[PDB]
XYZ file of N, CA and C in Angstrom:
603
model
N 12.316 13.404 3.356
C 10.847 13.239 4.236
C 10.150 14.008 3.349
N 9.792 14.914 2.742
C 8.861 16.153 1.786
C 9.279 14.764 0.606
N 7.266 13.967 0.376
C 7.128 13.111 -0.955
C 8.008 13.914 -1.700
N 7.866 15.138 -1.767
C 7.519 15.332 -3.534
C 9.125 15.794 -4.252
N 9.840 15.709 -2.804
C 11.081 16.468 -3.409
C 12.309 15.160 -3.801
N 11.626 13.799 -2.262
C 12.003 12.834 -2.674
C 11.345 11.744 -3.803
N 10.128 11.392 -3.671
C 9.967 10.903 -4.369
C 10.179 11.793 -6.014
N 10.293 11.228 -6.923
C 11.220 11.509 -8.533
C 9.817 11.307 -9.503
N 9.994 11.524 -10.659
C 8.602 11.628 -12.074
C 9.852 10.301 -11.984
N 10.932 10.396 -12.120
C 12.239 9.140 -12.061
C 12.049 7.768 -10.868
N 11.458 8.152 -10.224
C 11.644 6.570 -9.250
C 10.644 6.741 -9.668
N 9.279 7.117 -9.632
C 7.880 6.668 -10.065
C 7.382 6.064 -11.220
N 8.103 6.087 -12.528
C 8.342 5.961 -13.349
C 9.535 4.626 -13.440
N 9.954 4.642 -12.579
C 11.141 3.341 -12.470
C 10.326 1.903 -12.258
N 9.477 2.455 -11.856
C 8.334 1.320 -10.934
C 7.809 0.929 -11.872
N 6.940 1.620 -12.813
C 6.075 1.771 -13.369
C 6.018 1.073 -15.289
N 7.144 1.630 -15.326
C 7.953 1.107 -16.185
C 7.865 -0.879 -17.059
N 7.976 -1.105 -15.626
C 7.904 -2.947 -15.710
C 6.585 -2.955 -15.861
N 6.366 -4.371 -15.923
C 4.994 -5.083 -16.637
C 3.739 -3.876 -17.561
N 4.760 -3.341 -18.040
C 3.974 -2.677 -18.854
C 2.337 -3.577 -19.744
N 1.598 -3.491 -21.150
C 0.954 -1.875 -21.649
C -0.342 -2.513 -21.313
N -0.641 -3.585 -21.625
C -2.317 -3.701 -20.860
C -2.677 -4.785 -19.897
N -1.689 -4.004 -19.110
C -2.358 -4.147 -17.356
C -3.232 -3.189 -16.958
N -4.395 -3.143 -15.753
C -4.810 -2.269 -16.131
C -4.792 -1.103 -14.997
N -3.216 -1.496 -14.415
C -3.365 0.434 -13.651
C -2.234 0.869 -14.149
N -1.500 0.378 -15.708
C -0.863 1.187 -16.394
C -1.342 2.807 -16.379
N -2.471 2.854 -17.195
C -2.825 4.338 -17.041
C -3.808 4.778 -15.798
N -3.581 4.313 -14.904
C -4.035 4.563 -13.710
C -3.582 5.391 -12.279
N -2.509 4.600 -11.961
C -1.405 4.653 -10.912
C -0.765 6.040 -11.303
N -0.381 6.652 -10.333
C 0.239 8.182 -11.148
C 0.752 8.792 -10.054
N 2.075 9.053 -9.853
C 3.130 10.394 -9.494
C 1.947 11.415 -8.883
N 0.974 12.301 -9.146
C 0.062 12.519 -9.563
C -0.828 12.849 -8.287
N -1.225 11.925 -8.324
C -2.385 11.020 -7.922
C -1.961 10.662 -6.041
N -0.023 9.842 -6.376
C 0.261 9.822 -4.787
C 0.532 11.101 -3.774
N 0.569 12.113 -4.815
C 1.078 13.091 -4.400
C 0.300 13.942 -3.700
N -1.098 14.244 -4.609
C -2.183 14.481 -4.164
C -2.622 14.102 -2.395
N -2.704 12.295 -2.322
C -3.049 11.151 -1.111
C -2.353 11.382 -0.105
N -0.754 12.193 -0.298
C 0.342 12.373 0.615
C -0.157 13.508 1.149
N -0.649 14.283 0.685
C -1.020 15.657 1.687
C -2.482 14.932 2.417
N -2.915 13.875 2.753
C -3.855 14.087 3.832
C -4.079 13.327 4.931
N -2.197 12.576 4.493
C -1.137 11.558 5.430
C -0.484 12.477 5.785
N -0.125 13.434 7.135
C 0.767 14.302 7.300
C 1.491 12.901 7.777
N 1.302 12.582 9.168
C 2.043 11.534 9.597
C 3.076 10.456 8.962
N 3.287 10.141 7.441
C 3.505 9.325 6.706
C 4.886 10.199 6.597
N 5.983 9.221 6.349
C 7.426 9.511 6.278
C 7.467 10.693 6.989
N 6.750 10.685 8.595
C 7.211 11.317 10.212
C 7.198 11.015 10.832
N 7.480 9.907 10.880
C 7.229 9.094 12.215
C 8.806 9.514 13.775
N 9.659 10.382 12.537
C 11.033 10.293 13.247
C 12.098 10.934 12.598
N 13.428 10.088 12.330
C 14.608 10.878 11.498
C 14.112 11.680 10.569
N 14.457 11.830 9.756
C 14.728 12.385 8.381
C 15.307 11.085 7.477
N 15.814 10.329 8.095
C 16.584 9.423 7.505
C 15.663 8.301 7.685
N 14.712 7.950 8.786
C 13.729 6.690 9.010
C 12.821 7.475 8.301
N 12.036 8.821 7.670
C 11.262 9.639 6.446
C 11.267 8.250 5.370
N 12.596 8.474 5.282
C 12.966 7.878 4.017
C 13.310 6.671 3.951
N 13.453 5.485 4.670
C 13.148 4.128 4.917
C 12.063 4.125 4.957
N 11.303 4.625 5.354
C 9.091 4.380 5.340
C 8.821 4.905 3.892
N 8.924 6.041 3.336
C 8.725 5.548 1.803
C 9.058 4.910 0.702
N 10.727 4.438 1.392
C 11.040 2.910 0.099
C 10.146 1.877 0.806
N 9.954 1.085 2.283
C 9.062 0.331 2.022
C 8.254 0.308 1.578
N 6.816 1.607 2.127
C 5.875 1.577 1.219
C 5.828 1.457 0.090
N 6.578 2.028 -0.783
C 6.564 2.100 -2.689
C 7.043 0.195 -2.503
N 7.927 -0.193 -1.742
C 8.351 -1.982 -1.678
C 6.946 -2.818 -1.977
N 6.651 -2.749 -0.657
C 5.549 -3.042 -0.661
C 4.290 -3.484 -2.121
N 4.219 -1.926 -2.212
C 3.309 -1.304 -3.255
C 3.449 -2.084 -4.416
N 5.141 -1.985 -4.532
C 5.614 -3.050 -6.026
C 5.026 -4.806 -5.904
N 5.400 -4.895 -5.144
C 5.196 -6.323 -4.836
C 3.286 -6.888 -5.447
N 2.856 -6.132 -4.377
C 0.922 -6.210 -4.056
C 0.654 -5.699 -5.537
N 0.904 -4.661 -6.233
C 0.044 -4.415 -7.459
C 0.666 -4.905 -8.691
N 2.089 -5.809 -8.267
C 3.140 -6.334 -9.584
C 3.744 -5.133 -10.548
N 4.142 -4.396 -9.940
C 5.035 -3.040 -10.631
C 3.462 -2.090 -11.483
N 2.975 -1.841 -10.490
C 1.713 -1.361 -10.447
C 0.820 -1.505 -11.620
N 0.779 -2.808 -12.477
C 0.191 -3.535 -13.181
C -1.282 -3.654 -13.048
N -1.648 -3.584 -11.831
C -2.858 -4.408 -11.060
C -3.948 -3.828 -10.393
N -5.011 -3.181 -10.425
C -5.883 -2.614 -9.862
C -6.583 -3.393 -8.339
N -6.984 -4.041 -9.618
C -8.050 -5.320 -7.983
C -7.536 -6.731 -7.909
N -7.682 -7.213 -7.047
C -7.640 -8.701 -6.691
C -8.105 -9.484 -8.065
N -6.944 -10.361 -8.583
C -7.326 -10.743 -9.219
C -9.137 -11.862 -9.339
N -8.798 -12.215 -8.293
C -9.873 -13.320 -7.968
C -11.297 -12.327 -6.877
N -12.258 -12.467 -7.970
C -13.102 -10.786 -7.284
C -15.093 -11.685 -6.863
N -15.169 -12.758 -6.254
C -16.149 -13.592 -6.002
C -16.191 -12.756 -4.586
N -15.117 -13.390 -3.292
C -14.881 -13.106 -2.304
C -16.035 -11.812 -1.426
N -17.478 -11.762 -0.999
C -17.258 -11.000 -0.261
C -16.437 -9.870 0.672
N -15.562 -10.382 1.224
C -14.487 -10.246 2.291
C -14.951 -9.264 3.611
N -16.097 -10.303 3.890
C -17.021 -9.499 4.937
C -17.324 -10.244 6.929
N -16.943 -8.952 7.556
C -16.594 -9.738 8.477
C -17.728 -9.579 9.475
N -18.841 -10.077 9.419
C -20.536 -9.151 9.525
C -20.501 -8.785 11.438
N -19.078 -9.182 12.433
C -19.120 -9.006 13.496
C -19.454 -7.562 14.196
N -20.033 -6.486 13.355
C -18.989 -4.759 13.370
C -20.134 -3.734 13.934
N -19.662 -3.060 13.357
C -19.737 -1.178 13.021
C -19.920 -1.037 12.059
N -19.147 -1.611 11.112
C -19.033 -1.625 9.512
C -19.590 -1.885 8.880
N -20.931 -2.490 8.856
C -21.734 -3.652 8.469
C -21.770 -4.166 7.017
N -21.247 -4.917 6.332
C -21.344 -5.085 5.080
C -22.772 -4.919 4.293
N -22.975 -4.198 2.730
C -23.222 -3.328 2.538
C -24.193 -4.732 1.250
N -25.020 -5.222 1.287
C -25.372 -5.748 0.069
C -24.897 -5.890 -1.491
N -24.593 -6.988 -1.385
C -23.986 -6.688 -2.953
C -22.317 -6.214 -2.912
N -21.950 -5.863 -2.147
C -20.406 -5.398 -2.900
C -20.394 -6.073 -1.995
N -18.624 -5.990 -2.248
C -17.703 -6.910 -2.028
C -16.148 -5.663 -1.355
N -15.652 -6.775 -0.425
C -14.315 -5.567 0.476
C -12.783 -6.238 -0.502
N -12.582 -6.891 -1.461
C -11.361 -7.646 -2.402
C -10.741 -6.925 -1.676
N -9.671 -6.770 -2.557
C -8.926 -6.333 -2.313
C -8.266 -5.034 -3.905
N -7.937 -3.845 -3.313
C -7.843 -2.888 -4.321
C -6.734 -2.088 -4.184
N -6.055 -0.972 -4.758
C -5.800 -0.118 -4.714
C -3.727 -0.507 -4.808
N -3.165 0.276 -3.966
C -1.558 -0.068 -4.085
C -1.201 -1.119 -2.942
N -2.269 -0.842 -1.662
C -1.662 -2.031 -1.061
C -2.886 -2.717 -0.662
N -3.440 -3.381 -1.764
C -4.813 -4.242 -2.201
C -5.521 -3.897 -0.902
N -6.499 -2.697 -0.265
C -6.940 -2.767 0.443
C -8.610 -3.765 0.997
N -9.108 -4.245 2.065
C -9.333 -5.297 2.355
C -10.358 -5.336 3.102
N -11.526 -6.082 3.401
C -12.337 -6.532 4.497
C -12.974 -4.808 4.753
N -14.674 -5.211 5.679
C -15.612 -4.079 5.487
C -14.559 -3.465 6.449
N -13.888 -3.799 7.567
C -14.029 -3.180 8.488
C -12.541 -2.589 8.383
N -12.174 -2.442 6.881
C -10.785 -1.599 6.193
C -11.246 -0.373 5.282
N -12.367 -1.097 4.396
C -13.010 -0.095 3.654
C -14.001 0.878 4.291
N -14.894 0.305 5.853
C -15.139 1.396 6.536
C -14.542 3.136 7.488
N -13.512 2.495 8.273
C -12.788 3.522 8.597
C -12.257 3.868 7.440
N -11.234 3.508 6.351
C -10.679 4.377 5.527
C -11.518 5.058 4.720
N -12.632 4.937 4.022
C -13.723 5.728 4.003
C -14.271 6.929 4.748
N -14.783 6.637 5.898
C -14.695 7.882 6.923
C -13.859 8.933 7.009
N -12.621 8.393 6.875
C -11.199 9.199 6.912
C -11.065 10.280 5.722
N -11.051 9.336 4.596
C -11.352 9.631 3.141
C -11.871 10.734 2.703
N -13.509 10.336 2.921
C -14.840 11.044 2.546
C -15.370 10.460 1.466
N -14.979 9.073 1.701
C -16.250 8.373 0.388
C -17.227 7.398 1.154
N -18.247 6.763 0.914
C -18.796 5.178 1.201
C -18.317 4.170 1.248
N -17.301 4.152 1.874
C -16.440 2.797 2.044
C -17.028 1.563 1.684
N -18.108 1.310 2.451
C -18.860 0.163 2.818
C -20.203 0.069 1.027
N -20.198 1.387 0.834
C -21.533 1.467 0.086
C -21.027 1.131 -1.538
N -19.884 1.922 -1.742
C -18.502 1.985 -2.351
C -17.664 1.470 -2.906
N -17.212 0.227 -2.270
C -15.675 -0.053 -2.624
C -15.092 0.646 -3.430
N -15.756 0.069 -5.244
C -15.052 0.011 -5.426
C -15.008 1.231 -6.243
N -15.113 2.143 -5.428
C -14.536 3.630 -6.050
C -12.917 3.511 -5.699
N -12.808 2.730 -4.924
C -10.924 2.757 -4.680
C -10.727 2.007 -6.072
N -11.168 0.996 -7.165
C -10.065 1.182 -8.184
C -11.319 2.141 -9.055
N -11.626 2.918 -9.188
C -12.421 3.936 -10.311
C -11.425 4.847 -9.603
N -10.627 5.781 -8.832
C -9.888 6.877 -8.559
C -8.280 6.451 -8.302
N -8.065 7.033 -8.957
C -6.166 7.264 -7.960
C -5.921 7.677 -7.476
N -6.436 8.955 -6.694
C -6.369 9.242 -6.043
C -7.116 9.096 -4.376
N -8.425 8.307 -5.032
C -8.804 7.543 -3.145
C -7.761 6.580 -3.429
N -7.735 5.637 -4.196
C -6.527 4.464 -4.458
C -5.708 5.034 -2.949
N -5.072 5.852 -4.106
C -3.328 6.195 -2.785
C -3.860 6.162 -1.757
N -4.868 7.051 -0.887
C -5.508 7.236 0.180
C -5.628 6.121 1.100
N -6.053 5.314 -0.137
C -6.622 4.193 0.916
C -5.600 3.685 1.503
N -4.526 3.229 0.368
C -3.113 2.740 0.595
C -2.585 3.501 1.680
N -2.413 4.814 2.185
C -1.720 5.619 3.193
C -2.378 5.366 4.366
N -3.928 5.070 4.178
C -4.576 4.916 5.436
C -3.802 3.623 5.894
N -4.102 2.794 5.250
C -3.759 1.022 5.672
C -2.779 1.311 6.168
N -1.776 2.264 5.427
C -0.153 1.667 6.121
C -0.269 2.775 7.450
N -0.390 3.381 7.296
C -0.479 4.648 8.405
C -1.565 3.800 9.893
N -2.691 3.667 9.699
C -3.181 2.507 10.341
C -2.687 1.234 10.955
N -2.097 0.958 10.446
C -1.206 -0.637 10.491
C 0.065 -0.958 10.841
N 0.903 -0.681 10.487
C 2.112 -0.835 9.558
C 3.270 0.353 9.840
N 2.714 1.783 9.542
C 3.684 2.597 10.276
C 4.182 2.669 11.513
N 3.546 2.341 13.052
C 4.058 1.745 14.046
C 5.512 0.829 14.130
N 5.242 -0.209 13.348
C 6.073 -1.428 13.326
C 7.322 -0.897 12.497
N 7.528 0.302 11.510
C 9.034 0.667 10.871
C 9.699 0.735 11.877
N 10.031 1.529 12.744
C 10.807 1.261 13.786
C 11.647 0.665 14.104
N 10.010 -0.972 14.120
C 11.286 -2.307 13.937
C 12.188 -2.965 13.053
N 11.921 -2.307 12.428
C 12.340 -2.369 10.428
C 11.232 -3.540 9.551
N 12.310 -3.410 8.665
C 11.052 -3.385 7.072
C 10.655 -5.387 7.349
N 11.270 -5.698 8.038
C 10.836 -6.803 8.041
C 9.730 -7.702 8.774
N 9.455 -6.443 10.395
C 8.322 -6.271 10.996
C 7.242 -5.732 10.175
N 7.127 -5.550 9.071
C 6.007 -4.291 7.871
C 5.732 -5.508 6.949
N 6.655 -6.723 6.732
C 6.215 -7.731 6.019
C 5.215 -8.212 6.918
N 5.621 -8.632 7.894
C 4.406 -8.998 9.383
C 2.812 -8.533 9.668
N 2.985 -7.197 9.392
C 1.406 -6.314 9.518
C 0.782 -6.200 8.646
N 1.772 -6.648 7.853
C 1.218 -6.878 5.918
C 0.618 -7.836 5.716
N 1.108 -9.376 6.284
C 0.295 -10.547 5.587
C 0.846 -10.978 6.699
N 0.680 -12.555 6.753
C 1.251 -12.898 8.768
C 1.665 -14.981 7.655
N 1.249 -14.612 6.579
C 1.575 -15.676 6.045
C 3.144 -15.978 4.863
N 3.668 -14.535 4.624
C 4.935 -14.876 3.910
C 5.943 -14.682 4.754
N 5.750 -14.898 6.375
C 6.749 -14.446 7.464
C 7.175 -16.186 7.445
N 7.916 -16.257 8.883
C 7.983 -18.214 9.069
C 8.820 -19.222 8.271
N 9.554 -18.923 7.328
C 9.725 -20.237 6.255
C 8.042 -20.065 5.175
N 7.157 -19.346 5.266
C 5.979 -19.720 4.626
C 6.154 -19.054 3.013
N 6.510 -18.267 3.186
C 6.684 -17.899 1.492
C 7.860 -17.253 0.821
N 9.126 -17.768 1.102
C 9.970 -16.873 1.352
C 10.214 -15.991 0.048
N 9.830 -16.816 -1.375
C 9.851 -16.377 -2.450
C 9.430 -14.760 -3.023
N 8.138 -14.744 -1.703
C 7.441 -13.217 -2.198
C 7.953 -11.990 -0.879
N 8.456 -13.241 0.383
C 8.979 -12.040 1.512
C 10.377 -11.761 0.928
N 10.854 -12.671 -0.028
C 12.324 -12.028 -0.547
C 12.251 -11.035 -2.083
N 11.350 -11.290 -2.606
C 10.858 -10.424 -3.479
C 10.828 -8.975 -2.610
N 9.729 -8.456 -1.895
C 9.401 -6.950 -0.818
C 11.072 -6.914 -0.816
N 11.633 -7.738 0.120
C 12.859 -6.496 1.013
C 13.980 -6.463 -0.618
N 14.001 -7.055 -1.697
C 14.419 -6.952 -3.017
C 14.026 -5.569 -3.719
N 13.042 -5.263 -3.251
C 12.157 -3.920 -3.989
C 12.736 -3.525 -2.474
N 12.179 -2.978 -1.876
C 13.257 -2.107 -0.447
C 14.679 -2.007 -0.452
N 15.426 -3.079 -0.363
C 16.723 -2.652 -0.439
C 16.871 -1.762 -2.287
N 16.304 -1.751 -2.871
C 16.694 -1.305 -4.301
C 15.970 0.411 -4.307
N 15.299 0.440 -3.475
C 14.453 1.583 -3.293
C 14.798 2.695 -2.204
N 15.941 1.808 -1.759
C 16.725 2.122 -0.124
C 18.082 2.895 -0.828
N 19.072 1.849 -1.979
C 19.449 2.600 -2.682
C 19.226 3.564 -3.279
N 18.323 4.179 -4.559
C 17.801 5.270 -5.367
C 17.668 6.240 -4.061
N 17.391 6.379 -3.213
C 16.775 7.451 -2.155
C 18.037 7.637 -0.845
N 19.208 6.808 -1.539
C 20.250 7.301 -0.770
C 20.223 6.924 0.857
N 19.819 5.933 1.372
C 20.255 6.007 2.732
C 19.795 4.075 3.347
N 20.350 4.627 4.091
C 20.661 2.705 4.423
C 19.046 1.496 4.378
N 19.807 1.106 4.835
C 17.885 -0.007 4.672
C 17.713 0.266 5.987
N 18.701 -0.239 7.065
C 18.313 -0.148 8.385
C 18.293 -2.363 8.680
N 18.091 -2.653 10.165
C 18.209 -4.039 9.853
C 16.937 -4.794 10.231
N 16.638 -5.894 10.316
C 15.243 -6.697 10.256
C 14.840 -6.648 9.192
N 15.650 -6.682 8.015
C 14.345 -6.851 7.045
C 13.588 -8.137 6.319
N 13.911 -9.076 6.886
C 13.284 -10.439 6.435
C 12.533 -10.968 7.672
N 11.415 -12.003 7.296
C 10.565 -12.424 9.067
C 10.334 -14.254 8.023
């Protein structure tokens, strides 16, 4: 349940060791940054039982592993889209772009805005800070998780795949869906917890 003791250097390095070494994220994503970020999200891995908490940690790392390519990538590979939904109170800053950044590839003005308000930076004016500071990056990932995915954890890992995209369930992208499940099952083995029901979607 306490991330510092369940997520070890060995566990974190085990992921990052895969795809180095010229990866932009190789010398960015650290366990130290993750643990600093965890301090700001006390609800993470604490929704229910210690088993549920461990499943949540495994689930978080499963999605992060897939979305960043084992910590290879910081920013979305295509960077032209502003990702602006202008119908709002997180108005889009001129010239800025809210494409995916960090462990869970936080995207859109309507996510950068409130994430920044919670974390303590200007998410609309300075979204690149998520790519510049690994502590902020892990905080945005945990912010996104707690605000969008956490409530679905009790329904099983598969419900979290559906929470994160919509495009990788129901036969749409089996390879990516099963990739995520694969990481989750391994991390559950490593953290010594059963994976639970409803893994695929």
